[PDB]
Every structure is written in structure tokens, then in C-alpha cells.
Symmetry: C2
Subunit: 188 residues, 2 copies
Amino acid sequence: ASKRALVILAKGAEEMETVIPVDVMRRAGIKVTVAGLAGKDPVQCSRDVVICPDASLEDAKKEGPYDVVVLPGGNLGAQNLSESAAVKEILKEQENRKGLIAAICAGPTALLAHEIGFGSKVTTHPLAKDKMMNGGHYTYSENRVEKDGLILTSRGPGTSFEFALAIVEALNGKEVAAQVKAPLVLKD
Amino acid sequence: ASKRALVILAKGAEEMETVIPVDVMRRAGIKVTVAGLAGKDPVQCSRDVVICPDASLEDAKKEGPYDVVVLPGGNLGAQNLSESAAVKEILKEQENRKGLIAAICAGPTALLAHEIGFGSKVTTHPLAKDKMMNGGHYTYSENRVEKDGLILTSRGPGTSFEFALAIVEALNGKEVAAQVKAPLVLKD
């Protein structure tokens, strides 16, 4: 009866956009797997924080399905996610089974690379808007968190808490998200 | 001419309170050393994120002095910081040379354990107030970030961004902090 989250961690990922959702989701009782795109080895994030993943993406793929797939941002991290065939397969499968897909900052540009969720309203970091909108396949929003169908996006490192709590609310409901939120000392 | 920050990372530390200041400080051009209390080995944080430190505290101690010493929170992390003689020596030396000391959430209770900054106004997580105030050696504040002399404290994971930007402002000034803040997409 436990919900499950897959966080895909690639070199160059924004480490704040990785750790905040992982932490908050585990506070909500979600079983989170931080999976290294390139294997089980430690990942050097965009600001040189080095994180040890829980598993390789290859192994984590076999232990699906996941209730949410989470794509952190970071320009170079997002480019690695966009170029990976394994990520394409995971996201397409998640779209088909109508599971939640969540991406933050530059992370959403991987959805475009893999032709995921076309027609949805999405947000990105302001600096990633042009890239996301190439072709007009999405409708752009400037909301700090945007949820359209099964696609949940958010704008930046400073929206990471709102992003993570939106995932919790979608998976576990509003009361759990409020319970988890209170000890964090968030402003609003 | 480069400012230098020491972040002391112990088992049980709050990983969000560790990564946000490290990331934000590096965005500000500060040279940050994440030092493992127990050595160079990977550190399991409170919500099971595993971080590889840049150095052991023993080695980082020899490469001082630092313009700021940063103490993350996490109940068990803070207890490990409070019991460590090496931390006592680092903090006392930092107090003597009038360097900045920054601690967040439960982190400030290590200042009490090591008899640091008595008489200062401080804040903590609400759940750590009673512990910090044992003996009445400090004056308590409920501000999200509090700075009294060379002691800078903050309340929780949700104040981590304000905490980190206060460090940047103290070290590099208000204009750098504002420049670093803008791409983060913080609300206020």
C-alpha cells in the first residue's frame, strides 16, 4: 500500500532540485529510489555536491512501476536526460499507464525531447522557456507549480518545496501534505 | 581574495539544510569545503540521502581559517556535532578570531554544548527551543533568520534559502546576494 517514486539522477543535475523532493517525499512515507542514469556510481551535481544513488537506473527500471517519475533540473543534467534512450522508455511507459510525471526548472525540456505530454500546460525556468516551446507543442504557464493532467512542472530551485509538496498531495492527498509541511517552517 | 566556507557534515544531518547553503554559497563564488566529521567516507543524512564530503574534518581543519563555519541541523546530526571535541576546537577558534558562525534548525544546540556565543540572540527550530534555552545563556528569537554579532541562526529546512543568502550577504555583500537570488525563483 506504499507509493513509490523514481528520481533519475544524472551528472550536472541541480542538487537542490534533487534533494528537496527526495527528502520531502520520504517525510511523506513515499518509498523513493534515487537512480543514477549512468550506473550506481556517485554523481557530481551542478554545484559539485556528490550524491550516491540508491541504484542504477537499469536495476531500478526492473522494480517498477512507479507512481511518480521525477526529473530534476540543471541545464547539463536535463541534457543528459534528454539524450538517454532509457529515459525515453521509462517516460513513455509512465505516460501509457497514466502515471504521474514531474519535472522542475530545465527538467521539463526532457519531456519535449521524448515527445511526452504534448498539448499540456507546462512551466519551466524562464531561461528554458524558448527551448521548451520549440514547435509550440505545449502551452506555457508562469505559475510556480503547474499541473495539467499527469504532467506536473515547476520553475526553479526556489520552487522546489512547492513542487515536492504538490507531488505529495497528488499521491497521498492534501492532509498528508499539510502534516509534512508544518515542521518545515515554510513561509506560505 | 576568495572567501571560504566550512560545512561540517555528520551522520544524521538534514540533507536539505546541507545542500542548499553549499549550492547557494558556490553560486556566490565562495570556496566551500564540505567536511565529514568522521572522515572522508560518504555520509548518510537524516532522510537517507548519501553525500560524499570533499574532505575529512581533520584535513579541512589544517587548511583554515574559514570566513564562515556552517552547522547544518538534523536532530542526530546536531547531537554528533555537540559531542565532537574537534568541533569544539574549530568553533572556539572561530569565535576568537571573530569569524562568522552559522547554524540552522537543531544546529544551534551545538553552540550551547560548546559554550559558544553566550549572550547572543539566537533562533532554532521550535522543537529545539527548550534545549537551546537550558540555563538561559541566550536570548530567544522567533525570526526566520537571526544575526547577532558573529552568530547567525535560522529555524528550519524551509528557511534554508534565507539562511544561505544571509551568509552570502555577510561575506560578499548585498549586491552579490541579490544577483545570486534572482535566478533561483524565490517567492520573496
